[PDB]
Amino acid sequence: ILPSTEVVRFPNITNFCPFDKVFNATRFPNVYAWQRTKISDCIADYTVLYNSTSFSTFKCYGVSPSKLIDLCFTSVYADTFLIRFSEVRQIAPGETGVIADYNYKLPDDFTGCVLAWNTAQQDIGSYFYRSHRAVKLKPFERDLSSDEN
Amino acid sequence: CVNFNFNGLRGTGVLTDSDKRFQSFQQFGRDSADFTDSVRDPQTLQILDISPCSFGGVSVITPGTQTSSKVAVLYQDVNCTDVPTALGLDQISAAWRVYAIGNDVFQTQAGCLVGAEHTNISYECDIPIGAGVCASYNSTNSIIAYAMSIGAESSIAYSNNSIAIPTNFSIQVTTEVLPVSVSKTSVDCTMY
Amino acid sequence: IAYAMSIGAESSIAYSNNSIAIPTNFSIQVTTEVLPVSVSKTSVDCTMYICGDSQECNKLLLQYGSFCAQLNRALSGVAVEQDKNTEAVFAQVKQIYKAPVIKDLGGFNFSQLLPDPTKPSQRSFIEDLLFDKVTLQKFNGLTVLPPLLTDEMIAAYTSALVSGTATAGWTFGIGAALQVPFAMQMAYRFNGIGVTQNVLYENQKLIANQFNSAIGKIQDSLSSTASALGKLQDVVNQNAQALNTLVKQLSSNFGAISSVLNDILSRLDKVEAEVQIDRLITGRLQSLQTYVTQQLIRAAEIRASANLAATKMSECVLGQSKRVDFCGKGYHLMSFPQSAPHGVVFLHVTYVPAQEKNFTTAPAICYDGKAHFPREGVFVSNGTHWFVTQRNFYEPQIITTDNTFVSGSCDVVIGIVNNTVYD
Amino acid sequence: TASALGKLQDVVNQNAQALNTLVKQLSSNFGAISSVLNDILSRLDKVEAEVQIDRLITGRLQSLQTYVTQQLIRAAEIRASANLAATKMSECVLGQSKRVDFCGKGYHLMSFPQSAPHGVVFLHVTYVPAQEKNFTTAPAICYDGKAHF
Amino acid sequence: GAALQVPFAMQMAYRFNGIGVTQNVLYENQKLIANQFNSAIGKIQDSLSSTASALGKLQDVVNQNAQALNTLVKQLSSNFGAISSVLNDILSRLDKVEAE
């Protein structure tokens, strides 16, 4: 015996998913005050972003970017922020730096996708980052104390 | 026998309508040693059992291929009427369809045997089928199947006052063969 | 509670340098010995164990074909080996002798050992009790092939062996079955021990009632205590524990990202999932190799026990064995075999002396300046006379030239006493 | 008949099958990029080929351990058979054994030993009664008011 | 059954009677037989005291057990393809996601 045909059956969901209100906000938040948006009841097309958005880093841990079509997620959260161009390499499990110690730590049992793109023309101005914390953060934690020292 | 992708649960098997007990939040069922055996389709929500898409309990009885190249098929743990349902002859080849359902089916204790016919007279066991039945090739060109002859049924007249006494004897030489050693094989660290 | 082991009750025997103690009465008791013969013939499959009908998993196992060829060949050889073991322990006599028309053979009841004639089955009452005492993952490919000899043919073998021991004599295996009455059969069972043949012909009713009482007592012991056949249940528990260990070892991940291959094939691309599937298939192949090796060791132990049981049936059932404490605690070793689920149960009818009596003893007797020695038995002495008797029973007669033989002189032997020897 | 000495040929076939299956297990890759080490040492740098050679050497060590364990089991079974043969020669060749059906089907167990390729072959000269005659039988005989046996 | 008392000279005499040697033999030279038994006991005692290779099978059993345990603690000292044989420097030098 050998398999034949496909019995692919996915849930009857008709909503298209708000990528423009999570990837193209007017201004992304600071790294020390990163926002988390719960994404629910939508379809993960990943193909409306193939035009006019050049993805500088798309690294998935636990799953693969070639298999994101075939999977339906129980729940998705999106942590969104904006950093320097050389500090993108610090967003990975098991790593230390400024962003990975004092602003945003990722857990060791991570199962997700880090997606970062360079944009030096959309966001012009000045941003803030934490660099003098006494104790390193626990994973997926936030700190807003400006004068804790 | 189909490949299915149920909510990202890729697998291969035969889906059958089943009535397993699931909760309101369960999407797949774990069975045996963590195998997805009962699932729930997302559209028109019901319970589907994933049977394996053929039968693993299939034995092949043959003489040597230098002798006959003739084959017999044994299906265990199942009747022989549901052999087309378990084997699934909608997808298997045409030469398999003779052995799936034929004129020479035989139900026994260990399933059914296809390719051999029953003779009432019993001989010595050549190929051990199991559960008391046996098959042979000596039996104008077919595999024969029978039950084991445990021996010729004898009777002794215990007459409560009579003995039987031997009056003549014989001497015979019997041969017994016993192994003593095997070849002394030594392997090396280098060159292996 | 906690204590020290009692090695036994401390006894003492008065070795008085000239006294013997002689048994004056005996008893017959039946002892039960249980021996396993085979285990369940478990055959595992290459497909459906490691790979849940998966194409990529099978494609990778097609680089490990010789491993599963080894596993299938070894397990098939072990199954054929225990079919041979079950054939060798039971099928020794070829002619299946029928049951006698009368179950009362000279006063000895045999209805417990043989099946009743008003039944289409073949297992006897004791075999039914033994079957009632012993209580006995397919999508993983762990299939238990049925044994080649069904329990009805094994029951026919046991009925043939018991009826052959009841009707024929010592020549049950050697040549054809020569008919011998059971009273004289037991009499020449006694004559191959040291007990003189006359003993059975004085209290044959007492011996037969002792045999019937022992059969009833071992039947009651089988009915009451559910721990006499614990070896067969230990064998079945070992097989079930090995299979449960295998299906528990299937539930680990062996260093991969998951225990199951479905989410690995679903979440990962092929170039990354290849390493995880390779780690899982390597771990499952070593698990099967461990199971096959332990099955080989268990089959070796079961082969040793089956060869011991075959030797016991060739020496204690087909004939009388003179080995001390081989088949039961006693003197004569005549046994009945009964079937059991993956095992055999021997009932040995053994002869044990019971009541003892003290006597004073000299080795030789000086008559007419000549030292006479007993041909059989010892020289016992009462308070008035000197008699000679056998070792294993108290039956004394007068000192006669037929019972003694002359040798040597009357000064070369120590411990001699003297009186007259009758002519 | 060329099937009377099948046990010795079974022993030789088991040894040959074990050696052939060992050299068949040598032909796999055990998760490395190739079965042979020459193309691994030729195509890869040492820091990457170290893992592949480690996987291959681990697989081959487990194959040798499996072969040694199965050889130990086979040697245990052959030791049991050799001890049985030693008991048979000490009891049936060196003297007469009175055990029933130990050395041949018969009454006396006088045996001749002959050599065999990795084995011994015993020829037992056994005595079997052939022709039978029916008689009537009483255990004892009463003469002069006394029972003779 | 129970232990039935029998004198030792007659119990030797019926040890010979179960062989083929007639019972009268021991009752002519019982002192010679007893002195032979005593000399054999002294000789096997001297053989046990002198040669340290008569009980070599038990020492082979103990040596096999000790060799198995020593081989186990020698096999503990390898790395099995990891970066080190011991887990302490692996847990110290590496993060969790790599040392796993």
Ligand SMILES: *[C@@H]1O[C@H](CO)[C@@H](O[C@@H]2O[C@H](CO)[C@@H](O)[C@H](O)[C@H]2NC(C)=O)[C@H](O)[C@H]1NC(C)=O
């Ligand atoms: C290029 O990208 C633009 C925006 O990401 C896509 O424009 C949209 O196209 C769809 C259908 O073609 C329209 O319904 C939308 O209104 C457009 N959005 C706008 C104009 O903001 C465009 O389709 C992409 N083209 C290609 C070839 O990928």
Ligand SMILES: *[C@@H]1O[C@H](CO)[C@@H](O[C@@H]2O[C@H](CO)[C@@H](O)[C@H](O)[C@H]2NC(C)=O)[C@H](O)[C@H]1NC(C)=O
């Ligand atoms: C007992 O049996 C043996 C053989 O089983 C008989 O011996 C044979 O006798 C015939 C007749 O003279 C000879 O032709 C054969 O050569 C003998 N030997 C064999 C091996 O067959 C013997 O005659 C029998 N005796 C009695 C009294 O029946």
Ligand SMILES: *[C@@H]1O[C@H](CO)[C@@H](O[C@@H]2O[C@H](CO)[C@@H](O)[C@H](O)[C@H]2NC(C)=O)[C@H](O)[C@H]1NC(C)=O
């Ligand atoms: C020898 O022992 C047996 C039993 O061990 C005795 O047989 C019992 O005798 C009594 C008294 O007549 C009966 O009530 C019993 O039914 C008998 N059988 C059993 C099994 O107890 C026998 O009497 C003893 N003989 C001598 C001489 O002491």
Ligand SMILES: *[C@@H]1O[C@H](CO)[C@@H](O[C@@H]2O[C@H](CO)[C@@H](O)[C@H](O)[C@H]2NC(C)=O)[C@H](O)[C@H]1NC(C)=O
């Ligand atoms: C046979 O005689 C011995 C020797 O007397 C008995 O053993 C015990 O011996 C002590 C002293 O030697 C006596 O005080 C005991 O009374 C003896 N026991 C008994 C039960 O009387 C031995 O018991 C005697 N055999 C039998 C069967 O009574």
Ligand SMILES: *[C@@H]1O[C@H](CO)[C@@H](O[C@@H]2O[C@H](CO)[C@@H](O)[C@H](O)[C@H]2NC(C)=O)[C@H](O)[C@H]1NC(C)=O
């Ligand atoms: C010894 O006698 C028995 C008893 O007759 C023989 O067994 C058969 O017995 C039935 C009736 O009981 C007769 O009708 C048969 O004719 C008997 N068989 C034969 C072959 O005659 C038994 O066969 C006798 N032994 C021998 C060696 O003939």
Ligand SMILES: *[C@@H]1O[C@H](CO)[C@@H](O)[C@H](O)[C@H]1NC(C)=O
């Ligand atoms: C994102 O928003 C900016 C500003 O509104 C706009 O210029 C740009 O085209 C948008 N890009 C996408 C992909 O929507």
Ligand SMILES: *[C@@H]1O[C@H](CO)[C@@H](O)[C@H](O)[C@H]1NC(C)=O
């Ligand atoms: C839409 O969803 C419902 C709810 O399960 C389902 O019954 C129905 O078949 C779906 N229809 C389509 C067209 O997918």
Ligand SMILES: *[C@@H]1O[C@H](CO)[C@@H](O)[C@H](O)[C@H]1NC(C)=O
């Ligand atoms: C089929 O097998 C089942 C159990 O294996 C049995 O109950 C049934 O009688 C068999 N026959 C039919 C016709 O279903």
Ligand SMILES: *[C@@H]1O[C@H](CO)[C@@H](O)[C@H](O)[C@H]1NC(C)=O
């Ligand atoms: C088995 O079939 C044959 C062929 O007809 C027949 O002669 C024989 O009597 C049958 N066996 C029995 C026991 O009826």
Ligand SMILES: *[C@@H]1O[C@H](CO)[C@@H](O)[C@H](O)[C@H]1NC(C)=O
């Ligand atoms: C011993 O037995 C004999 C038997 O003839 C008898 O004459 C004698 O009186 C007995 N002696 C004693 C002390 O019982």
Ligand SMILES: *[C@@H]1O[C@H](CO)[C@@H](O)[C@H](O)[C@H]1NC(C)=O
């Ligand atoms: C046994 O030893 C005692 C103790 O000296 C002795 O009196 C007795 O005579 C010996 N027995 C014989 C039969 O000589």
Ligand SMILES: *[C@@H]1O[C@H](CO)[C@@H](O)[C@H](O)[C@H]1NC(C)=O
């Ligand atoms: C019998 O024995 C006694 C003592 O043991 C001895 O005094 C006597 O002389 C012996 N009888 C004969 C005829 O020698």
